């Protein structure tokens, strides 16, 4: 807690505003009040008379739609001296430094004599307010000229909190009174006196626009406009009572900004409605009560951490929208009501004002999810979470912040089509003041009703919506709008539910004798798409059936049909980014591959079933030692293989899945290594013979494995299953592991570091591999999108020639970090969201100073405890102490399976580690510069290939794409097993050996999967190399130089590049075609 408390204090002083600018603004607006005093009064005027007053003036009255017409504007207009006051955060002195800038809210109280008791009907008070603003702007403008301040002051109108009904004047300063450095803008709010209109008449249920339907939005604006100082006085009291009021406020402010939460309007579409004031008003209420029994949940003695914890805890678990609401008295213990108004409600009995009126239902769930999601990190003790909760902006990219994004282009967008405009209807102008508010509600409701359980959260954003307009104009002007609609286009963003996203059929209400209302709306909503279907269980229900595709999810089709049918038949819905991502995933060459969804693992299961049949045979075979257990460890067994398994597609590198065979513990195992495997081979030999005799349909052969250094006698049995799958079997013996330890102990001190590396690979293949496949497999079920995203991640690495040096396990652990540790983000539920988040992590990962440690557990045991957590931390510090610059080790990946942290990340050259991070950083930079689109995504997955010193082009004799099981094909294994090799791609084996020979001098790379990244034929692969700095320049000759060089002087040599190329060329033989240097 002490660490967290000090972290808070550090954050506050960093964001603390500089007091010098406070004086600078205080100097200005203090004089501004004097200018307001000069402004003269006015007499009663009709709309005709005020219009004559403003016909020729540069200023234009910003009348709120519907603008007053001569018939209904019988009530007259007048201006009188307001009672100025300063309100907002600046009044409470709780503001902070904001690079984008802050705003100071100065309130103008229209004198009460300028209103009638019934001016809150039919925009009567609003239009009076508009001219009052207009009259002030004219006089303020001329006086600004008189004082010569106009030179550096720019004046424009704007909507308060993006509220179209409340235009305001904004003062900002361009580059003595110049406050441009202060980064502040004075906002002039024309508020109403308190209690001018009976608040009971302004309750949300009541209506104030005659046409009856209620007017919650219109009622809130006028009532809120009349209640500003009262809340300030309410807040002003509280900060005395609790010493930590302003501190608790700013922590809320920073938290809200990172999540992209603001006080601005939300029914328009912008995510927000919950701002500092709502955070402050809420937290004030909790200090006065908040419980069902009206007990205090927060105490004035609480510190900033406790005050912040309670409000975040409060918002997380108690519901304010559907079931339950709060009432408090600003002027009486606050109590939680179980009843709900179906909308975010924070009632104030003293003022009869709901503070959450601007807060939308859809946004409220997201707000609730964030608080509850953060409450989990706040309670977390294993890991520090200060940075994530507060120092991480998740609103930078929507696609990172939202799983799916669809942009919809409405028709006729210099006015919207008559049909869509006609759909607006009069009941909705009274309900929704602006068509933008109505249209956002329309698209939300159909999208929510259509998708249902397929999604968790939906956000509708109106791209290109402006809120400030020139003083010469009455309302905001959009380029496509033509003063009709203030937006460019609508973007539909979702947080999908992986569990039920891809369901083929959307279930509906059950059949009945009489058509029920719920069923009725179901049939009407889906129209022809509606159908009544029966199932195996025998239930009869109304449901509509969709079709799965390998290119796009069901979510794309449903929203397209639903929006077109209800919103407008001419709408255009397009999300090509996900489609391009889907296409990059290699399409398997199985029946109905195209119609298969990306989340289906039937291919993997079929491979497992084939293994099960063999798994039975080997048990029943009699051997000298009873078989103990066979543990499959292949990539496909954990649903991580880049391309799905395909029968007889033996050209695939991952065709042969490794399998560990272990026998009963015996004392007769050889005590010397070389005999031990040769005994293991003897066991494999007998297994092959009996398998050949009893089960002739199975085919088998032996192969040479040399992955473990210096153990040149480990022999593996490759089994070709009749279903068309390959399995590689290796024997594990308990004596095996001690023998390697024996080798390390007896080895010379200089050689011990080499031997331990040999052990490191052994445990990586035999011991840790078992644990790796087990946990990833089980975890993969909860994380539906893990199996796809990892495969694209490996595909992305292969394109840039990184898989050759990066072990497949390491890629998996990097790719699961966004899932086991999604904070501050959510669990990815989309292919795009998961992949880019992996990119985001790698870009910002400081592997030199920050270790990567993962809790391989299912979503909320085996969770890392404090002792284990600290233990892993000490390991990183000890390693970095020996390797500060990180040459020997770059990536530190540890978990329960890997406490050492070096198992899967050892031996990677630093250039490849830097190249990996360098690629991730640049990729993120491209995203910021240019948005996700077809052009960018192509750049992400195409290799530059120019940075490499020399590049070698290779082509295989035949196209391997068909034999790899990739649909742009063998149906049986060759009669002669020697004929497997002719359809193989050996370039990786070429590179690995060439790496060994030129380890001291060169770093060669190539594409592992040629069928995927080898063109249409899958036959072209490229070998790329790098010359180290030391051998790039000339060197003095010495015996230990260990490089192919040529003389220049009697004691100087230089790298012999041309000789190396010839060695490379003839090694590939006919494979090599061209050399680029």
């Amino acid at each position: 807690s002490n660490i967290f408390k000090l972290q808070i204090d550090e954050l506050l002083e960093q964001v603390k505003l500089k007091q010098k600018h406070v004086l600078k603004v205080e100097k200005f607006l203090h004089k501004l009040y004097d200018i307001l005093q000069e402004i003269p009064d006015w007499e009663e005027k009709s709309l005709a008379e005020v219009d004559s007053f403003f016909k020729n003036k540069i200023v234009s009255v910003p009348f709120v739609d519907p603008k007053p017409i001569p018939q209904n504007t019988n009530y007259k207009f007048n201006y009188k001296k307001p009672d100025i006051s300063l309100i907002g955060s600046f009044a409470l002195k709780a503001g902070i430094y904001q690079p984008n800038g802050s705003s100071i809210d100065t309130l103008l109280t229209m004198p009460k004599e300028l209103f009638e008791k019934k001016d809150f009907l039919n925009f009567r008070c609003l239009h009076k307010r508009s001219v009052y603003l207009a009259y002030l702007t004219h006089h303020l403008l001329i006086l600004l000229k008189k004082d010569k301040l106009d030179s550096f002051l720019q004046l424009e109108y704007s909507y308060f909190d993006n509220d179209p009904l409340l235009p305001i004047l904004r003062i900002s300063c361009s580059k003595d009174y110049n406050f441009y450095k202060t980064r502040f803008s004075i906002n002039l709010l024309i508020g109403f006196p308190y209690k001018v209109f009976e608040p009971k008449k302004l309750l949300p249920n009541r209506n104030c626009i005659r046409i009856l339907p209620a007017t919650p939005l219109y009622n809130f604006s006028v009532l809120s406009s009349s209640t500003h100082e009262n809340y300030l006085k309410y807040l002003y009291k509280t900060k005395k009572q609790t010493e930590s009021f302003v501190e608790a406020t700013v922590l809320g402010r920073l938290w809200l900004q990172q999540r992209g939460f603001s006080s601005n309007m939300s029914h328009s579409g912008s995510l927000g409605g919950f701002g500092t004031f709502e955070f402050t008003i809420l937290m004030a209420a909790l200090l006065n009560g908040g419980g069902i029994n009206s007990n205090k949940i927060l105490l004035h003695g609480f510190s900033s951490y406790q005050l912040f914890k309670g409000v975040i805890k409060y918002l997380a678990t108690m519901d304010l929208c559907h079931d339950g609401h709060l009432q408090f008295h600003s002027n009486p213990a606050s109590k939680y009501i179980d009843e709900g108004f179906q909308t975010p409600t924070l009632f104030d009995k003293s003022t009869k004002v709901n503070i959450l009126t601007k807060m939308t239902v859809s946004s409220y769930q997201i707000l609730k999810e964030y608080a509850g999601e953060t409450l989990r990190m706040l309670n977390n003790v294993v890991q520090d979470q200060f940075s994530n909760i507060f120092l991480t902006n998740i609103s930078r990219f929507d696609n990172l912040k939202y799983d799916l994004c669809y942009d919809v282009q409405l028709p006729l967008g210099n006015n919207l089509e008559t049909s869509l405009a006609a759909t607006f209807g009069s009941m909705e102008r009274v309900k929704f003041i602006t068509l933008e508010n109505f249209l956002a509600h329309k698209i939300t409701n159909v999208a929510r009703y259509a998708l249902g359980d397929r999604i968790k959260y939906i956000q509708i954003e109106m791209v290109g919506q402006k809120s400030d307009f020139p003083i010469t104009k009455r309302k905001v002007y959009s380029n496509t709008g033509g003063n009709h609609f203030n937006f460019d286009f609508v973007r539909v963003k979702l947080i999908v539910n992986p569990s039920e996203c891809d369901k083929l059929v959307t279930k509906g209400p059950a059949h009945s004798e009489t058509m029920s209302t719920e069923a009725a709306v179901f049939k009407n909503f889906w129209g022809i798409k509606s159908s009544l279907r029966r199932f195996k269980d025998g239930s009869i229900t109304h449901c509509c059936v969709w079709s799965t595709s390998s290119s796009e999810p069901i979510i794309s089709s449903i929203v397209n049909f639903a929006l077109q049918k209800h919103v407008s038949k001419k709408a255009q819905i397009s999300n090509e980014t996900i489609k391009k991502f889907h296409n990059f995933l290699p399409l398997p060459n199985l029946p109905s591959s195209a119609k298969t969804s990306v989340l289906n693992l039937s291919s993997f299961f079929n491979l497992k079933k084939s293994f099960d049949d063999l798994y039975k045979i080997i048990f029943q075979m009699k051997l000298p030692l009873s078989v103990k257990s066979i543990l499959p460890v292949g990539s496909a067994f954990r649903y991580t293989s880049l391309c799905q398994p395909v029968p007889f597609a033996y050209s695939d590198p991952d065709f042969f899945q490794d399998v560990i065979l272990e026998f009963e513990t015996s004392p007769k195992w050889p005590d010397e290594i070389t005999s031990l495997e040769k005994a293991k081979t003897a066991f494999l030999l007998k297994i092959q013979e009996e398998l050949s005799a009893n089960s002739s349909t199975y085919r088998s052969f032996f192969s040479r494995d040399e992955s473990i250094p210096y153990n040149l006698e480990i022999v593996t049995l490759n089994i070709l299953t009749p279903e068309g799958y390959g399995f590689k079997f290796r024997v594990l013996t308990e004596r095996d592991e001690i023998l390697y330890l024996r080798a390390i102990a007896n080895a010379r001190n200089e050689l011990k570091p080499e031997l331990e590396a040999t052990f490191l690979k052994f445990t990586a293949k035999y011991l840790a591999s078992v644990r790796h496949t087990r946990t990833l497999e089980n975890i993969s079920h909860s994380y539906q999108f893990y199996s796809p995203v990892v495969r694209l991640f490996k595909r992305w690495l292969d394109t840039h020639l990184l898989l050759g040096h990066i072990t497949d396990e390491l890629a998996e652990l990097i790719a699961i970090k966004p899932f086991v540790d999604p904070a501050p983000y959510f669990i990815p539920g989309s292919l795009e969201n998961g992949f880019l988040k992996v990119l985001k992590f790698i870009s910002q990962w400081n592997w030199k100073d920050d270790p990567l440690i993962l809790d391989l557990v299912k979503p909320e045991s085996e969770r890392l405890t404090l002792a284990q957590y600290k233990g892993i931390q000490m390991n990183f510090t000890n390693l970095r102490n020996s390797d500060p610059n990180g040459t020997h080790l770059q990536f530190f990946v540890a978990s329960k399976n890997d406490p050492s942290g070096i198992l899967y990340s050892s031996g990677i050259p630093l250039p490849i580690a830097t190249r990996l991070t360098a690629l991730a950083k640049v990729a993120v930079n491209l995203l910021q510069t240019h948005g996700l689109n077809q052009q960018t995504i192509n750049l992400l997955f195409t290799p530059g290939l120019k940075d490499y010193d020399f590049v070698v082009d290779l082509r295989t004799p035949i196209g391997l794409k068909s034999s790899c099981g990739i649909l742009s094909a063998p149906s049986n294994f060759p009669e002669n097993l020697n004929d497997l090799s002719e359809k193989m791609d050996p370039t990786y084996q070429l590179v690995k050996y060439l790496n060994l020979k030129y380890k001291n001098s060169l770093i060669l790379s190539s594409r592992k999967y040629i069928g995927v990244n080898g063109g249409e034929k899958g036959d072209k692969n490229v070998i790329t190399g790098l010359i180290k700095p030391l051998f790039k320049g000339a060197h003095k000759f010495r015996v230990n130089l260990d490089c192919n060089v040529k003389p220049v002087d009697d004691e100087n040599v230089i790298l012999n590049k041309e000789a190396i190329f010839h060695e490379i060329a003839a090694f590939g033989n006919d494979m090599v075609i061209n050399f680029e240097t």
Binding site: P911, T914, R915, T917, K921, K946
Partner: peptide
């Protein structure tokens, strides 16, 4: 075009 990043051999990008 393509994603091209200058190869770093001193871990300077980090």
């Amino acid at each position: 075009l393509s994603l091209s990043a200058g190869f770093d051999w001193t871990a300077s990008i980090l």
